[PDB]
Amino acid sequence: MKRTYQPNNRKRAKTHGFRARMKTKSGRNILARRRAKGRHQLTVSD
Template structure:
């Protein structure tokens, strides 16, 4: 059996990165919510 979590920075950035979040309406809502909350980092890549 293979490990279920095989980290890859590229895959992570493409799936949960800033550009991906910013490209959809709901993604922009997520970013806005995280800004409101005052998060240190908004997404996986930024």
Template sequence: GVRFVTYGREYQPSNIVRKRRHGFLARLRSKSGRKILTRRRMKGRKYLSH
């Protein structure tokens, strides 16, 4: 059979998933997430996370 390979439609936006995965509270919950927030604070980012 013929196989069709399509790329480029991986990103299906969803605000709920976005907040759950990359949100501020998600960052606070894990040790590595808190590290990310600390680094972004030190860098002087205006926005720390979603």
């Protein structure tokens, strides 16, 4: 039956996918909360 997620990630593009933290300015720092903030790569392009 239905799991808890399943494929198809539209709400991880124009919302929470790479370039979608400008729509929410105080999300830009959130996007920048693991790149220009601390070590490590990112989590949207592996």
